């Protein structure tokens, strides 16, 4: 009905599958497999090159399936989905690779493997409206493709929403890019895909949702018992590490493949998540790009986005609270404060810097009789007091508000972390301040903190943190250093 | 109780044995040796094939023994190990080839040769967790086979470790690959051989230990004075060169047979090793894949692993906490730097490359007005300004952070090492950067460096490096090019 080839780099490789000898003999005389595919509406899942070969994320997985089983593939695209299923029932094809669906088919003449592709819904807005709250009780125009996701899930975040269903993904994203619709919500695997290709200058993702996910499946006849158990053996070998590398070939931002598969949790940790589904997040002082809050008091910044990722990884949900709390979104490890809280393993390391006025006569040094501010929760005060007994050291309640005091010349310097200084300078005092490293001081190690009788939440977050690729933490830090603001807070910038 | 033959690929031929005339008459009159063997649980040491012939690592050595002594060999498998030892008492067998043991049996009848197979403990983890520290006071789950190594050894590295003891090596390694257990530790010649077979893309060795080693022996009755001496003649002729080629056929990675036997060290050198322990290693800038420091401050990367190997070769003892220094782990040779340090002989050469952004209109030369960064400790600034005097050449303190500046368009190019650029691009900026060779410059030559007054250490490292096969260095760089970090450091990756 159609014939093709596969076009893919074999950069991703799989361990050998453990197949029975009855399965190994079945594959050898089967020799070849006919799979019914189809071009996706967007190019991400499956497209064709000039040599009439197939390409995309689905092609990369098919390439792995071809090698993991040591069997030949024949790719056909039928006119519709129904003629493909007719060929499956007739025996013209062995497998049908389904389009993106919300659930597998239940008719028992069909057998479905475990899901191949697993993707999540994403909230998309303009780059200059990203810092606005991700929920609203006010009227709002929300775009979507077809009926994904349904009305009621959109209404949990925007109860007064007017939903506009588009035929096409590009058209729906462009309507937000122009300004007709305030948000778009849709499948992330294809939304992140196209934003980087067409709307990179104008749109970005601000939130992932845990449900309702979309999948595609391999589909066989119910009679093809051995084929389905072999296909399932191949899909189980597709770990978060394997899925991440496959999707790296086609996604820049929005690669959530590292959390397609669950984490290795004890049955006690799984019961604990089950009995504590919604935890409270203590509010941090303003410390961009790590911990920031929007007008609704919800955690944004890198720590806020990591919390979004942890939700998809673990199922835990987090709600705002202000200064019965359960998690601190971003904290500096210290020996003293460990007697007050419990620390997760560090996932960001950063150096301490001195922030000073950028003038012609600037020297990268402290001087006798300078006024240098340092936040009280950095217990560097004792060590700098001995390195610089010459300096008048001023403990401060509000770290971010001390930048302005340096800009006005009241303070000679201020102690901060590298990227916290870069944000404050670029966003609020460009070309007015600079920084340099503090010599002879250990690095800061950022992570989450908890109440101290919470071993389960600590051990669970540690597993989730260890599962996040470091390049995703780097992309998130790039994202939030460049993120435009919509408000200024007088207290975070001018207190005292 | 069960009888076989010998299968092997005679790729290794041994030098003729210096045998006494009295011994050749004994071998001529004996004419045949009854040797009790046993099938290892893995195929690496001993298995059988189609014709019921012995095959494996033990088989290749038995083949060499048959040709070294020019005698016939009958191999028998008794029920358990105690029945083979019983048969050796009554004289029914001449030799018993032992299983892997940490010691030869105490029995004061039983004579053991020098060790035949020599193997070391190995710590194993998943590839994506390999940058976690090799020791930790934190709770961990360690998998092992039976009771090797003992708990007191495992607790030296992990005092709060839960040790799960498996009966079967495959299941133990599978538990680490699936994420249930954090590490595995066990006999290397068995562990790495099975990783080559089934876990090549999910498990790898991260550390070899000096002790407790494991061996197998030729066990005879002490009555056999002539048999024992002829057996020791054979075992003494198994040089590093011979053992490495025998293990080559069954181990693709982690083949430590090149350090089974001691190096040809002088008396003075051996005394220097034993009388200068806890040698101090200088910390290098973040320089992947050659050098980088984990969350413990320990040296990792290719240079870090080669130090671990050098320790197993020579007994050199390096401090795990880096810095009054005794060795620079990896350094580019320079004739003018030789006034400050001594260099070992180079064992890796690599060219310099320009890093630029991957655009459609990219073309592989510089232009004038371009801002190109070069590390200040590279001594190419002299020559590069004369070849490209129309270019603005900027010295930088942080080579790894300059990659980001090129990505952002603030720099036009960056001077780097081929594999240094390959790592940064592969892991942090894929499809956003590329590189091409710098024309008309020599290659950088990598080796260890030492203070001026340490000739003995430099002479030892030279002998050790010469004994490391280049394929193992190639094996190590493959591993570290593909290996990501476990955390990000903002100073390593974010510019100024």
PDB file of N, CA and C in Angstrom, chain A residues 126-193:
ATOM      1  N   UNK A 126       3.096  33.486  25.826  1.00  0.00           N
ATOM      2  CA  UNK A 126       4.135  34.366  25.315  1.00  0.00           C
ATOM      3  C   UNK A 126       5.241  34.538  26.351  1.00  0.00           C
ATOM      4  N   UNK A 127       6.443  34.856  25.865  1.00  0.00           N
ATOM      5  CA  UNK A 127       7.590  34.965  26.760  1.00  0.00           C
ATOM      6  C   UNK A 127       7.441  36.122  27.740  1.00  0.00           C
ATOM      7  N   UNK A 128       6.769  37.197  27.340  1.00  0.00           N
ATOM      8  CA  UNK A 128       6.606  38.360  28.200  1.00  0.00           C
ATOM      9  C   UNK A 128       5.372  38.278  29.091  1.00  0.00           C
ATOM     10  N   UNK A 129       4.614  37.184  29.018  1.00  0.00           N
ATOM     11  CA  UNK A 129       3.512  36.929  29.940  1.00  0.00           C
ATOM     12  C   UNK A 129       3.752  35.684  30.784  1.00  0.00           C
ATOM     13  N   UNK A 130       4.971  35.140  30.770  1.00  0.00           N
ATOM     14  CA  UNK A 130       5.229  33.871  31.444  1.00  0.00           C
ATOM     15  C   UNK A 130       5.197  34.009  32.960  1.00  0.00           C
ATOM     16  N   UNK A 131       5.610  35.158  33.494  1.00  0.00           N
ATOM     17  CA  UNK A 131       5.638  35.348  34.938  1.00  0.00           C
ATOM     18  C   UNK A 131       4.260  35.608  35.534  1.00  0.00           C
ATOM     19  N   UNK A 132       3.222  35.728  34.709  1.00  0.00           N
ATOM     20  CA  UNK A 132       1.869  35.822  35.224  1.00  0.00           C
ATOM     21  C   UNK A 132       1.451  34.479  35.821  1.00  0.00           C
ATOM     22  N   UNK A 133       0.484  34.482  36.742  1.00  0.00           N
ATOM     23  CA  UNK A 133       0.081  33.227  37.389  1.00  0.00           C
ATOM     24  C   UNK A 133      -0.413  32.192  36.387  1.00  0.00           C
ATOM     25  N   UNK A 134      -0.134  30.927  36.694  1.00  0.00           N
ATOM     26  CA  UNK A 134      -0.516  29.803  35.850  1.00  0.00           C
ATOM     27  C   UNK A 134      -1.939  29.325  36.108  1.00  0.00           C
ATOM     28  N   UNK A 135      -2.660  29.977  37.017  1.00  0.00           N
ATOM     29  CA  UNK A 135      -4.087  29.776  37.204  1.00  0.00           C
ATOM     30  C   UNK A 135      -4.754  31.140  37.297  1.00  0.00           C
ATOM     31  N   UNK A 136      -6.060  31.170  37.021  1.00  0.00           N
ATOM     32  CA  UNK A 136      -6.783  32.430  37.112  1.00  0.00           C
ATOM     33  C   UNK A 136      -8.267  32.160  37.265  1.00  0.00           C
ATOM     34  N   UNK A 137      -8.969  32.904  38.119  1.00  0.00           N
ATOM     35  CA  UNK A 137     -10.435  32.853  38.140  1.00  0.00           C
ATOM     36  C   UNK A 137     -11.105  33.809  37.164  1.00  0.00           C
ATOM     37  N   UNK A 138     -10.329  34.610  36.446  1.00  0.00           N
ATOM     38  CA  UNK A 138     -10.842  35.644  35.560  1.00  0.00           C
ATOM     39  C   UNK A 138     -11.032  35.091  34.155  1.00  0.00           C
ATOM     40  N   UNK A 139     -11.773  35.802  33.297  1.00  0.00           N
ATOM     41  CA  UNK A 139     -11.942  35.339  31.914  1.00  0.00           C
ATOM     42  C   UNK A 139     -10.614  35.275  31.169  1.00  0.00           C
ATOM     43  N   UNK A 140     -10.509  34.298  30.271  1.00  0.00           N
ATOM     44  CA  UNK A 140      -9.246  34.000  29.602  1.00  0.00           C
ATOM     45  C   UNK A 140      -9.543  33.191  28.344  1.00  0.00           C
ATOM     46  N   UNK A 141      -8.750  33.426  27.298  1.00  0.00           N
ATOM     47  CA  UNK A 141      -8.871  32.715  26.029  1.00  0.00           C
ATOM     48  C   UNK A 141      -7.814  31.618  25.972  1.00  0.00           C
ATOM     49  N   UNK A 142      -8.258  30.368  25.862  1.00  0.00           N
ATOM     50  CA  UNK A 142      -7.380  29.204  25.932  1.00  0.00           C
ATOM     51  C   UNK A 142      -7.506  28.423  24.631  1.00  0.00           C
ATOM     52  N   UNK A 143      -6.377  28.206  23.963  1.00  0.00           N
ATOM     53  CA  UNK A 143      -6.337  27.489  22.699  1.00  0.00           C
ATOM     54  C   UNK A 143      -5.925  26.038  22.914  1.00  0.00           C
ATOM     55  N   UNK A 144      -6.380  25.172  22.010  1.00  0.00           N
ATOM     56  CA  UNK A 144      -6.062  23.752  22.072  1.00  0.00           C
ATOM     57  C   UNK A 144      -6.291  23.139  20.698  1.00  0.00           C
ATOM     58  N   UNK A 145      -5.706  21.962  20.495  1.00  0.00           N
ATOM     59  CA  UNK A 145      -5.867  21.200  19.262  1.00  0.00           C
ATOM     60  C   UNK A 145      -6.931  20.137  19.499  1.00  0.00           C
ATOM     61  N   UNK A 146      -8.016  20.208  18.730  1.00  0.00           N
ATOM     62  CA  UNK A 146      -9.123  19.242  18.783  1.00  0.00           C
ATOM     63  C   UNK A 146      -9.697  19.267  20.199  1.00  0.00           C
ATOM     64  N   UNK A 147      -9.890  18.121  20.852  1.00  0.00           N
ATOM     65  CA  UNK A 147     -10.460  18.060  22.192  1.00  0.00           C
ATOM     66  C   UNK A 147      -9.437  17.608  23.231  1.00  0.00           C
ATOM     67  N   UNK A 148      -8.151  17.829  22.962  1.00  0.00           N
ATOM     68  CA  UNK A 148      -7.109  17.485  23.916  1.00  0.00           C
ATOM     69  C   UNK A 148      -6.481  18.754  24.465  1.00  0.00           C
ATOM     70  N   UNK A 149      -6.533  18.992  25.782  1.00  0.00           N
ATOM     71  CA  UNK A 149      -7.211  18.149  26.770  1.00  0.00           C
ATOM     72  C   UNK A 149      -8.695  18.521  26.908  1.00  0.00           C
ATOM     73  N   UNK A 150      -9.489  17.716  27.617  1.00  0.00           N
ATOM     74  CA  UNK A 150     -10.927  18.003  27.723  1.00  0.00           C
ATOM     75  C   UNK A 150     -11.199  19.307  28.463  1.00  0.00           C
ATOM     76  N   UNK A 151     -12.478  19.693  28.465  1.00  0.00           N
ATOM     77  CA  UNK A 151     -12.858  20.977  29.048  1.00  0.00           C
ATOM     78  C   UNK A 151     -12.601  21.012  30.549  1.00  0.00           C
ATOM     79  N   UNK A 152     -12.926  19.926  31.255  1.00  0.00           N
ATOM     80  CA  UNK A 152     -12.914  19.976  32.713  1.00  0.00           C
ATOM     81  C   UNK A 152     -11.503  20.093  33.278  1.00  0.00           C
ATOM     82  N   UNK A 153     -10.499  19.524  32.609  1.00  0.00           N
ATOM     83  CA  UNK A 153      -9.131  19.677  33.100  1.00  0.00           C
ATOM     84  C   UNK A 153      -8.659  21.114  32.908  1.00  0.00           C
ATOM     85  N   UNK A 154      -8.990  21.721  31.764  1.00  0.00           N
ATOM     86  CA  UNK A 154      -8.681  23.134  31.560  1.00  0.00           C
ATOM     87  C   UNK A 154      -9.406  23.985  32.594  1.00  0.00           C
ATOM     88  N   UNK A 155     -10.619  23.575  32.970  1.00  0.00           N
ATOM     89  CA  UNK A 155     -11.419  24.356  33.906  1.00  0.00           C
ATOM     90  C   UNK A 155     -10.915  24.251  35.339  1.00  0.00           C
ATOM     91  N   UNK A 156     -10.060  23.272  35.645  1.00  0.00           N
ATOM     92  CA  UNK A 156      -9.489  23.197  36.985  1.00  0.00           C
ATOM     93  C   UNK A 156      -8.497  24.326  37.234  1.00  0.00           C
ATOM     94  N   UNK A 157      -7.875  24.843  36.176  1.00  0.00           N
ATOM     95  CA  UNK A 157      -6.949  25.965  36.267  1.00  0.00           C
ATOM     96  C   UNK A 157      -7.586  27.289  35.872  1.00  0.00           C
ATOM     97  N   UNK A 158      -8.483  27.274  34.889  1.00  0.00           N
ATOM     98  CA  UNK A 158      -9.123  28.480  34.370  1.00  0.00           C
ATOM     99  C   UNK A 158     -10.621  28.219  34.284  1.00  0.00           C
ATOM    100  N   UNK A 159     -11.341  28.358  35.400  1.00  0.00           N
ATOM    101  CA  UNK A 159     -12.785  28.071  35.378  1.00  0.00           C
ATOM    102  C   UNK A 159     -13.575  28.998  34.471  1.00  0.00           C
ATOM    103  N   UNK A 160     -13.112  30.224  34.266  1.00  0.00           N
ATOM    104  CA  UNK A 160     -13.779  31.179  33.380  1.00  0.00           C
ATOM    105  C   UNK A 160     -13.073  31.265  32.033  1.00  0.00           C
ATOM    106  N   UNK A 161     -12.742  30.115  31.454  1.00  0.00           N
ATOM    107  CA  UNK A 161     -11.980  30.059  30.215  1.00  0.00           C
ATOM    108  C   UNK A 161     -12.907  29.892  29.019  1.00  0.00           C
ATOM    109  N   UNK A 162     -12.556  30.553  27.919  1.00  0.00           N
ATOM    110  CA  UNK A 162     -13.190  30.330  26.624  1.00  0.00           C
ATOM    111  C   UNK A 162     -12.215  29.518  25.778  1.00  0.00           C
ATOM    112  N   UNK A 163     -12.577  28.272  25.496  1.00  0.00           N
ATOM    113  CA  UNK A 163     -11.694  27.316  24.838  1.00  0.00           C
ATOM    114  C   UNK A 163     -11.973  27.340  23.342  1.00  0.00           C
ATOM    115  N   UNK A 164     -10.917  27.480  22.546  1.00  0.00           N
ATOM    116  CA  UNK A 164     -11.019  27.533  21.091  1.00  0.00           C
ATOM    117  C   UNK A 164     -10.268  26.331  20.536  1.00  0.00           C
ATOM    118  N   UNK A 165     -10.998  25.412  19.910  1.00  0.00           N
ATOM    119  CA  UNK A 165     -10.420  24.185  19.376  1.00  0.00           C
ATOM    120  C   UNK A 165      -9.938  24.431  17.951  1.00  0.00           C
ATOM    121  N   UNK A 166      -8.655  24.180  17.711  1.00  0.00           N
ATOM    122  CA  UNK A 166      -8.053  24.362  16.400  1.00  0.00           C
ATOM    123  C   UNK A 166      -7.924  23.027  15.678  1.00  0.00           C
ATOM    124  N   UNK A 167      -7.986  23.091  14.346  1.00  0.00           N
ATOM    125  CA  UNK A 167      -7.684  21.921  13.529  1.00  0.00           C
ATOM    126  C   UNK A 167      -6.214  21.541  13.628  1.00  0.00           C
ATOM    127  N   UNK A 168      -5.341  22.535  13.761  1.00  0.00           N
ATOM    128  CA  UNK A 168      -3.923  22.398  13.475  1.00  0.00           C
ATOM    129  C   UNK A 168      -3.101  22.974  14.619  1.00  0.00           C
ATOM    130  N   UNK A 169      -1.965  22.334  14.910  1.00  0.00           N
ATOM    131  CA  UNK A 169      -1.126  22.782  16.018  1.00  0.00           C
ATOM    132  C   UNK A 169      -0.504  24.142  15.728  1.00  0.00           C
ATOM    133  N   UNK A 170       0.064  24.309  14.530  1.00  0.00           N
ATOM    134  CA  UNK A 170       0.702  25.573  14.172  1.00  0.00           C
ATOM    135  C   UNK A 170      -0.271  26.736  14.304  1.00  0.00           C
ATOM    136  N   UNK A 171      -1.495  26.560  13.802  1.00  0.00           N
ATOM    137  CA  UNK A 171      -2.486  27.630  13.859  1.00  0.00           C
ATOM    138  C   UNK A 171      -2.814  28.009  15.297  1.00  0.00           C
ATOM    139  N   UNK A 172      -2.887  27.019  16.190  1.00  0.00           N
ATOM    140  CA  UNK A 172      -3.231  27.301  17.580  1.00  0.00           C
ATOM    141  C   UNK A 172      -2.081  27.984  18.308  1.00  0.00           C
ATOM    142  N   UNK A 173      -0.845  27.546  18.056  1.00  0.00           N
ATOM    143  CA  UNK A 173       0.306  28.203  18.664  1.00  0.00           C
ATOM    144  C   UNK A 173       0.466  29.625  18.143  1.00  0.00           C
ATOM    145  N   UNK A 174       0.227  29.832  16.846  1.00  0.00           N
ATOM    146  CA  UNK A 174       0.373  31.161  16.264  1.00  0.00           C
ATOM    147  C   UNK A 174      -0.647  32.142  16.826  1.00  0.00           C
ATOM    148  N   UNK A 175      -1.852  31.667  17.155  1.00  0.00           N
ATOM    149  CA  UNK A 175      -2.863  32.555  17.720  1.00  0.00           C
ATOM    150  C   UNK A 175      -2.441  33.082  19.086  1.00  0.00           C
ATOM    151  N   UNK A 176      -1.661  32.304  19.837  1.00  0.00           N
ATOM    152  CA  UNK A 176      -1.046  32.830  21.052  1.00  0.00           C
ATOM    153  C   UNK A 176       0.128  33.731  20.696  1.00  0.00           C
ATOM    154  N   UNK A 177       0.918  33.331  19.696  1.00  0.00           N
ATOM    155  CA  UNK A 177       2.057  34.137  19.265  1.00  0.00           C
ATOM    156  C   UNK A 177       1.615  35.526  18.827  1.00  0.00           C
ATOM    157  N   UNK A 178       0.492  35.614  18.112  1.00  0.00           N
ATOM    158  CA  UNK A 178      -0.050  36.915  17.739  1.00  0.00           C
ATOM    159  C   UNK A 178      -0.562  37.659  18.967  1.00  0.00           C
ATOM    160  N   UNK A 179      -1.558  37.094  19.645  1.00  0.00           N
ATOM    161  CA  UNK A 179      -2.097  37.711  20.841  1.00  0.00           C
ATOM    162  C   UNK A 179      -3.589  37.510  21.004  1.00  0.00           C
ATOM    163  N   UNK A 180      -4.180  36.667  20.155  1.00  0.00           N
ATOM    164  CA  UNK A 180      -5.614  36.412  20.252  1.00  0.00           C
ATOM    165  C   UNK A 180      -5.947  35.585  21.486  1.00  0.00           C
ATOM    166  N   UNK A 181      -5.106  34.610  21.812  1.00  0.00           N
ATOM    167  CA  UNK A 181      -5.359  33.686  22.906  1.00  0.00           C
ATOM    168  C   UNK A 181      -4.264  33.815  23.955  1.00  0.00           C
ATOM    169  N   UNK A 182      -4.670  33.775  25.224  1.00  0.00           N
ATOM    170  CA  UNK A 182      -3.735  34.002  26.319  1.00  0.00           C
ATOM    171  C   UNK A 182      -2.829  32.804  26.566  1.00  0.00           C
ATOM    172  N   UNK A 183      -3.332  31.588  26.364  1.00  0.00           N
ATOM    173  CA  UNK A 183      -2.553  30.381  26.585  1.00  0.00           C
ATOM    174  C   UNK A 183      -2.919  29.337  25.543  1.00  0.00           C
ATOM    175  N   UNK A 184      -1.965  28.454  25.257  1.00  0.00           N
ATOM    176  CA  UNK A 184      -2.221  27.224  24.524  1.00  0.00           C
ATOM    177  C   UNK A 184      -1.880  26.047  25.423  1.00  0.00           C
ATOM    178  N   UNK A 185      -2.650  24.969  25.300  1.00  0.00           N
ATOM    179  CA  UNK A 185      -2.400  23.743  26.044  1.00  0.00           C
ATOM    180  C   UNK A 185      -2.529  22.565  25.087  1.00  0.00           C
ATOM    181  N   UNK A 186      -1.533  21.689  25.094  1.00  0.00           N
ATOM    182  CA  UNK A 186      -1.523  20.575  24.171  1.00  0.00           C
ATOM    183  C   UNK A 186      -0.391  19.619  24.477  1.00  0.00           C
ATOM    184  N   UNK A 187      -0.241  18.629  23.599  1.00  0.00           N
ATOM    185  CA  UNK A 187       0.748  17.576  23.797  1.00  0.00           C
ATOM    186  C   UNK A 187       2.161  18.142  23.720  1.00  0.00           C
ATOM    187  N   UNK A 188       2.982  17.830  24.728  1.00  0.00           N
ATOM    188  CA  UNK A 188       4.292  18.469  24.844  1.00  0.00           C
ATOM    189  C   UNK A 188       5.268  17.969  23.787  1.00  0.00           C
ATOM    190  N   UNK A 189       5.212  16.676  23.449  1.00  0.00           N
ATOM    191  CA  UNK A 189       6.186  16.115  22.515  1.00  0.00           C
ATOM    192  C   UNK A 189       6.127  16.832  21.174  1.00  0.00           C
ATOM    193  N   UNK A 190       4.944  17.297  20.775  1.00  0.00           N
ATOM    194  CA  UNK A 190       4.797  18.030  19.526  1.00  0.00           C
ATOM    195  C   UNK A 190       4.714  19.540  19.739  1.00  0.00           C
ATOM    196  N   UNK A 191       4.393  19.999  20.951  1.00  0.00           N
ATOM    197  CA  UNK A 191       4.355  21.434  21.208  1.00  0.00           C
ATOM    198  C   UNK A 191       5.759  22.000  21.390  1.00  0.00           C
ATOM    199  N   UNK A 192       6.557  21.388  22.271  1.00  0.00           N
ATOM    200  CA  UNK A 192       7.963  21.766  22.385  1.00  0.00           C
ATOM    201  C   UNK A 192       8.669  21.619  21.047  1.00  0.00           C
ATOM    202  N   UNK A 193       8.342  20.555  20.315  1.00  0.00           N
ATOM    203  CA  UNK A 193       8.935  20.325  19.004  1.00  0.00           C
ATOM    204  C   UNK A 193       8.821  21.557  18.111  1.00  0.00           C
TER     205      UNK A 193
END
